[model samples]
Target: TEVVMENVTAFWEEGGTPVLKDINFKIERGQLLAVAGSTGAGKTSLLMMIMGELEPSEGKIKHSGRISFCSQFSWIMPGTIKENIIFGVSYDEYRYRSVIKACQLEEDISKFAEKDNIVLGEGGITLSGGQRARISLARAVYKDADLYLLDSPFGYLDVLTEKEIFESCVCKLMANKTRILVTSKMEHLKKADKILILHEGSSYFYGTFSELQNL
Candidate 1:
């Protein structure tokens, strides 16, 4: 199934401010779409619309597939690393291992003698910021949903970690799932199947990442 947003315009207030206007796009399964723009350019608002968290004041959005969302702020619960990754899903030994490897958690986990079984006391205090972000990402990927909406998932990571996570965890592991990611990292533009650049409250550019460079 495809996700389509047709002439969508969103208003945050009943008749006050407009966050997104005349947005239109179509995403097919397995395609990765990137959203980029300056601060307060409505990038996050666009993702919110796709997630059905906001209603468009004009136009329509069509989709009939499950969506997994990962926000800029990583939310973790008190539990073992394995429990956190698997969440509520029944344990699948092979898939769990795959998630760990893909998210680059093997080395991090190895540092802890208890490994995946080690408990993260009170919202993962033992893990670093980057580790927490990757863990959140792994949890999302483990869900194996029809679509993934990631808002600045790599924002907290350093340059090297960001590249590694994007290439292995996102590009390789979730290659077969539809994904819409919001990022300010220009380097990732070219890696995306399609790029959407928002300016002010409008879609300033929408096409291949290479085309965005020429703009």
Candidate 2:
């Protein structure tokens, strides 16, 4: 297993209401775990906890492997679009192009006159919300990591584009990589090896999609 949480609980304020309560789950290598929750259900907190940024007030979390994360909020550096996505890594043209295609960014790139060379920030042109989000996602996806934690990367994307990226990037490109995807879209729940539904800091449902259907 790449990740295991035993009776995990977290609190933002000490001696107050807990943010996560008695959560337990295991994620094997190459498995895709889908996290679903209403607003403020601690979905992002769970990812933070896994990332070792948030300390748990109770129990423990064991995550073994390098992690690649695409957060909900996207930020771009003051550089060319290609530089931002490469993020100082050695360029591999094959993989770079694949990441662009997988993230469905080809059409978006075609519109830019300078294409990948377009500068961002510091008097440079600004990209649309969807473009920024995809760039963030592409950066993460371009990295080779044992585990990928994606936090709602599809919010600004259209339905058709979202579906394409989900299938191409998540299902095909990262198929054998352990991935924890946080999404409100229920359609993706069926594609996951395990689905965790959080409510009030606890997971009321944790099981396969067929089992979720029965419930």
Candidate 3:
């Protein structure tokens, strides 16, 4: 099923100002839609609504399927890398090799003697930003959900790592799902199936990257 946000409006938790107003969009399978804007532009809030993690003050959200979310921040609990990847799902054992390779966690995990069961201490402070991003991505990919909402999954990484994660993890996982992403980088935005530029709580412009460049 598809996800639709019809004239959705929301405000900040402190009730200070509006975060989103009259936000309307639709996402279908195999589509990569992006919400492009500057920091504090309500991008995250909009994504939360779509992921069904937040409620809008007004309007309606229609979603009929499983949902998965990938955020740049990794909140690692006390567990091994594999446990984190599997979350609560039962291990198929067959997917073990492919999951590690796809997320490029093989080398990183191998460095630890425990390998897949390597301890990911409290807060995951030992892991680099890129590592955390990829691990979080791996968890999301393992979900194999109907829809995916990713918020700046490429934020805290170098060019190579960013490219690798996007090419390996994002591309593979989002193959047949309704993918909605929030990003600021121009290079990645160029890959979006549908791009919407948010400016001053309104749709400043909406179209393909080619269309935006021609404007």
Best by lDDT: 2
lDDT of 2 by residue, 6-116 (tens): 999999888878999999889999999999899889899999998888899889888887889999898889998889889988899999999999988888888899988
Q: Which candidate leads in TM-score?
A: 2
Candidate 3 lDDT over 1-215, as tens digits, reads 38777787787675856788787776666788878887777787777777666788889998877888887576566788888888897787757657668777888988887788777866543887777777887777777678888887765677877777666666674566678877776766787778877765666667789998897
lDDT of 1 by residue, 1-215 (tens): 46888898988888877899898788887888888888899988887887788899899898777888888888678999999989998889899898889888898999888888888856444777888888898888888688899888874688987887888877888888899988867767888888888898798888987776676
* Ordering by TM-score: 2, 1, 3
User: TM-scores for all candidates?
Assistant: 0.93, 0.96, 0.87
> What lDDT score goes with residue 112 in model 3?
82
C-alpha lDDT of candidate 3 relative to the true structure? 0.75
**Between candidates 1 and 2, the lDDT winner:** 2
Clashes of each: 0, 0, 0
TM-score of 1: 0.93
Q: Please tell me which model should have the higher TM-score, number 2 or number 3.
A: 2
Query: Considering summed lDDT, which 10 consecutive residues are worst modelled in model 1?
Result: 120-129
